[PDB]
Design a protein around this ligand. Structure first.
Ligand SMILES: Nc1ncnc2c1ncn2[C@@H]1O[C@H](COP(=O)(O)OP(=O)(O)NP(=O)(O)O)[C@@H](O)[C@H]1O
Ligand SMILES: Nc1ncnc2c1ncn2[C@@H]1O[C@H](COP(=O)(O)OP(=O)(O)NP(=O)(O)O)[C@@H](O)[C@H]1O
Ligand SMILES: [Mg+2]
Ligand SMILES: [Mg+2]
Lengths: 236, 237
């Protein structure tokens, strides 16, 4: 009776806080659960470099795979693209475990204010673009439909959620390069902004630069594309 | 630049391993070295509670992360590494990939260890730190492969530029190369620490339990059965 819980939701929506609260209640019910997410490995490097992301991603999948043989796993990650949620569901599929996607939502104004209170580590402008561009889960594939959609500005009943997940766990389980380029150019942009401490007008400019660059890319070799993106930001 | 190296920390709780790791990782990265800091607490602290049955998973997961990382990055192993068997296991990972390694032994006076502990809410009982201090075998006491590359006094300022220089020099060199008792010693200590913390034992109950453990370990001298019995003993007591 092991299940895979897949969080999804934009930066600052409260994934990690929700993960820790849910884990506490599950363990109260004598469920063995582990919270795993890419930041565990990413933040173990003293700096960020794009070449680290492959190791970060694989390491995170490996831990989840190993963990899910013996424990419930809560995947604490933005999981912005359907391709990521697919990779995770395929881990559950490998071991015939049930899974539940839990989509955490909040308005853009809430995410911005939360970002501001945590020291605006990711740029506000970047959260705004992510918000505009986000394809909400379940809008394409039936396997991607959320088990729960949770408004994190309203009271959340963790006992009820726990009850529902343990019920689900007893049920019979039923079952991109463009994404990488999109994901890493965004991270590169955020890092440059933070590194070079760009002003608000410069921030708008580089976010717009990225948008234009990606239109050109679309209308590919990832490493060449990302290297050129870096060179472009430097040039600009 | 050139080569990859495994850096193995060792030292008692509160000595400053995690702080040292972050400072060292920063100076290595400043020199364009790709380095990652990995320790068993990454995985241990991802569970909402501690249970002894998690530890084998925690151990194996951590070794697998270290193994996978060392293929591409310097790795700083941020763990107490209280037993020489642990330092052996880590060295065998370096050996498997023919990578240099360096044990860095961090030290401080019992005095300072306790003050630091206290300064963090006594997350581990002071009495337990004391007992670890007494029973600790310093690296290199027995095997030459176990000898510290550096011994750092954390009671004093640390020259990280000097340390980075020495490690980088080491990394260009040509590399040269029961635990059931450790497991029981280790988990009974953790169980004791957990009981003290969760039943808020007073100072005197703490001493009895610490002594209870040593007596127990003398009598016992497979791990699951023995550990279940130890828990039963503490409950009974
Ligand atoms: N349910 C909630 N209600 C109010 N505030 C919250 C809630 N959840 C999280 N927060 C606050 O929002 C901020 C971000 O929360 P966190 O749990 O770190 O979000 P996250 O989605 O995990 N962020 P990230 O890891 O960067 O994508 C923190 O400062 C929290 O205190
Ligand atoms: N060199 C130092 N000088 C003064 N204080 C220090 C030093 N190193 C660490 N500390 C402080 O001591 C406390 C414990 O440091 P930490 O780096 O967590 O130790 P640790 O060895 O990693 N502990 P643990 O993970 O429990 O084995 C922290 O509050 C530090 O700020
Ligand atoms: Mg988070
Ligand atoms: Mg530490």
């Amino acid at each position: 009776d092991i299940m895979l819980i897949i969080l999804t939701g934009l930066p600052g929506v409260g994934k990690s806080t929700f993960s820790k609260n849910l884990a506490k209640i599950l363990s109260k019910n004598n469920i063995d659960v582990i919270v795993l997410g890419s930041d565990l490995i990413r933040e173990s490097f003293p700096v960020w470099k794009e070449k680290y992301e492959e190791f970060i991603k694989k390491s995170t999948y490996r831990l989840i795979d190993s963990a899910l043989k013996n424990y419930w796993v809560i995947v604490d990650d933005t999981n912005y693209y359907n391709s990521m949620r697919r990779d995770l569901i395929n881990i559950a599929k490998k071991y015939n475990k049930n899974y539940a996607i839990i989509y955490l939502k909040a308005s853009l104004d809430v995410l911005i204010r939360r970002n501001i209170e945590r020291g605006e580590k990711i740029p506000n402008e970047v959260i705004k673009k992510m918000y505009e561009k986000f394809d909400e889960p379940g809008k394409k594939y039936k396997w991607d439909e959320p088990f729960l959609i949770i408004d994190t500005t309203k009271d959340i009943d963790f006992n009820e959620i726990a009850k529902k997940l343990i019920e689900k766990s007893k049920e019979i389980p039923k079952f991109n390069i463009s994404d990488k380029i999109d994901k890493e150019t965004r991270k590169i942009v955020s890092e440059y902004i933070k590194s070079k401490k760009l002003d608000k007008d410069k921030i708008k400019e580089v976010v717009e630069l990225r948008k234009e660059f990606l239109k050109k890319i679309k209308k590919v070799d990832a490493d060449r594309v990302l290297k050129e993106f870096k060179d472009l930001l430097n040039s600009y």
